[PDB]
Amino acid sequence: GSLTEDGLSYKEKFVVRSYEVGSNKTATVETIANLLQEVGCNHAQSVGFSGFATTTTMRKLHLIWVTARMHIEIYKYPAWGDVVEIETWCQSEGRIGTRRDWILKDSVTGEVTGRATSKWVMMNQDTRRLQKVSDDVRDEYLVFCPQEPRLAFPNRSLKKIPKLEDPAQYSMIGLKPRRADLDMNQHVNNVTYIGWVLESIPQEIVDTHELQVITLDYRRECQQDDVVDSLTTTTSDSQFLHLLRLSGDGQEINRGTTLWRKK
Template identity: 75%
Template sequence: MLKGCAAAGPIRVREAGAVQCRGLGAAGRGRRRPVATSVRCSRPEAPPVTGLAAAAAAAGGGGMGLAESLRLGRLVEDGLSYKESFIVRCYEVGINKTATVETIANLLQEVGGNHALSVGFSTDGFATTPTMRKLRLIWVTSRMHIEIYKYPAWGDVVEIETWCQGEGRIGTRRDWIIKDLATGEVIGRATSKWVMMNQDTRKLQRVSDEVREEYLVFCPRTPRLAFPEEDNGSVKKIPKLEEPADYSRSELVPRRADLDMNQHVNNVTYIGWVLESMPQEIIDTHELQTITLDYRRECQHNDMVDSLTSLELADDYSTNGSAIGKQHKKEHHRFLHFLRLSSTGLEINRGRTEWRKLVR
């Protein structure tokens, strides 16, 4: 399992001459602030600093106030969800000049963290409520599911909406919808499940009524899902890969750049490790459509990891009614994945990916 990240990321500013204007991120319990709707301006003026930004500035957090005023994000739906827009940079695309799945996952993490900041949750990297901080409790990811219908290209602007809600007595879930800002087309969706863990003992904890009351005020009043739950890949069980695997990469080593602010391997790194053992012929002719990961164990900076992959033979390919489901099934391939510690063989996570034929 991995620790949830709730830290603000780098300020995004368009390089080509003009400065990109940022809307004010709303702050506080259900409070909303005006948002600048224009994307570019020739002579930007400093926006007024209010809400969370003003509080940070008053407390001496001038940098925090500046970041809040420049971030192109805002609370919507009466403060029950959050939207933020991003431009796809040249260093975020792959050989096809489209965003990589790691880029998409990083943006999901960024907008989720900024949502937590906008409603006043802590900036310690854990998105914790006051009661959680008092009891040394944190959120950790237990499952992540991403579907990408169309990869944004270099220079495209994407808008990501996110919201969270309760998930039984032991966790929460966070959902995302990804749109092409220029057309309004939904180009991707994602969902995740989180459980509560004691930061010191590393044991799971039930979500108390006090904690639920603190975060549910920012959640939709009725359940809202990024995917229809019936016949949806995000809820399907992932079987353990049987060895010997069809493909493998051994003793992958975490880099310093793979560590997050909490000194653990960032969850996006696991996606890269899964893809390391994919057969090259699939990488060359297909693109990743869906990835699901179950997180079972934390990985430390001095661990080495084995990545195992095998083709999964299955008759059904769930696509949630999207256009990709109309393609012929023979153009799709599904794989099972297994990451383990090289030294002990203990499971880190297991996953499933689906790949569609690449159209050039």
């Protein structure tokens, strides 16, 4: 891929690979989330960042970007073989943090086959303590963002997610991350959590429906040595509320909604 003409967004294409697709020979949503991360990481490279996207000042202060929310809407999943073009860019949301967005297109048709957004926040790597953004860093990244609004989602991506009340309708328990689920920093990839959420979706559903939407608030990181319970309940198309929590204490690590359409 590369930066667009104006250097305020990044474009890249991906060929969907054998092991990337689900049972209907189209890309799994995990494959997608992976591709957003990947193009995101190249956008950050192309402009001289680190996958924490750190600046000089940030590295100095031990600060990091971390995802607070991740929101994906898919209209059509690409097929094994198909080429998908993904464009991505960031904007600031003042001192709250930044937003990254992606547009997914068919490289053939040029039609929008999906879109994503995400909320990133500034955090002390060591203390896990969030801080608001100083003006000095709000000067380092701004030159890589458009100043005029550009919204993938101009609203479902912004609705507030409630906490699932016991008993949950479905559940998958005793999930734990293996080494493939850890990143280059030995942190559980944010894609893993997506995978875990959807373990408590009944197979019946996965077979009759395509996933349309997924929203996901991140609350706590799952450690290598932790174990997670995945809970789901129907709130209805078909809709679900979700909760990931520590198997033992019941400490929450994620919450999220899905939306599925008949085929």
